[model samples]
Target: SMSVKKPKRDDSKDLALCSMILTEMETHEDAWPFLLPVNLKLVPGYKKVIKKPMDFSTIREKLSSGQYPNLETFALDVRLVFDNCETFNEDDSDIGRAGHNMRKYFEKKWTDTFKV
Candidate 1:
């Protein structure tokens, strides 16, 4: 008899923040590769998830488009990526440090805004 495995909860649902970051990366073609450690293929719905033709400005427009609904929710979305990420660290190479700063930017910039 084959044992049935329970379905894993989809952690990729809240990747809007990551998508925005990727869009931000578009402005920097030279540096984007270093920050991208997670293979998009492994991400669920990688093909159709990110809004096409997205860049830093487009992402900003999308950010205020009522997609996230709230700041805390947005923060959580970024955290999910940070939690599951395999790259980024201050003690590593330039690319690794860039990755770390990229993730930290969400926390410091966004999360810091609500520190009232």
Candidate 2:
């Protein structure tokens, strides 16, 4: 029933320190803006600037479903969540400031658990 070729090691095992990092960020104080998908109803202009929208809930769903094949991509989505936030929101605004803080916390957790 196998229909694919094998590569290197079994790298997509999801042995999960990534899960820990996410959980910590989920409880963060500045995680308000990132907890869910952004509202296009309130900010319609967000459709143009942010092409690839990402959110904490989406990331968690992907992780739970084993959608991320590796840590690199898992982290990629996480970074995108913040980058999209910064793009839509400015540094002077509360949401933007919150995004910046959330990024700091994410990086700290990443390094603390496993610096790559």
Candidate 3:
């Protein structure tokens, strides 16, 4: 066990202690972790997450008023990319945060659209 040399009673020390306690309690994996065994560069291009799904190029007033139907397709696409673990271009990238962000977006949509 490495000795944390942060000063006592300081906010940094308190924050570090809180972090250590939470880390120990949950046995959670480190945030933004880098993994071993990099083998993702060989996957098919179309199956990969080459770009974000939404387009914000033109924020026209008409478009913002729900002109396009099938709005769920965007969320579906996000789910598809997140579901396929083998489709990443590089294994070393921290894609968990990206996945979490997608899920949060979906969740927000879900919450607003339907009561759960």
Task: Choose the strongest candidate by TM-score.
Answer: 2
What is candidate 1's lDDT per residue for 1-116, written digit by digit as tens? 27978885444533564455545544544346333334557756534544321223333454657576555555554454444332232336564555466666655644433343
Greater-TM-score candidate between 1 and 2: 2
Model 2 Cα lDDT, one tens digit per residue, 15-104: 477887888889988888888887878777887778998999999999999798788899899999988888778897999998888888
Please say which candidate is ahead in lDDT: 2 or 3. Answer: 2
Worst 10 residues of 3 by lDDT: 53-62
lDDT of 1 at 110: 45
Least well predicted 10-residue stretch by lDDT in candidate 2: 6-15
Model 3, residue 16: distance off in Å is: 43
Report the lDDT of model 2 for residue 112: 72
Model 2: lDDT to the true structure: 0.83
- Candidate number with the higher TM-score (2 or 3): 2
> In model 2, which regions exceed 4 Å deviation?
1-14
Candidate order by lDDT, decreasing, is 2, 1, 3
Residue 57 accuracy (lDDT) in model 1:
36
**Candidate 1: pairs in clash:** none
Clashing pairs in 3: none
Candidate 3: tens digits of C-alpha lDDT, residues 1-116? 37867553323333333333223322324312222212346535532554432212111221345443343443343354445432543444566554454445545645554343
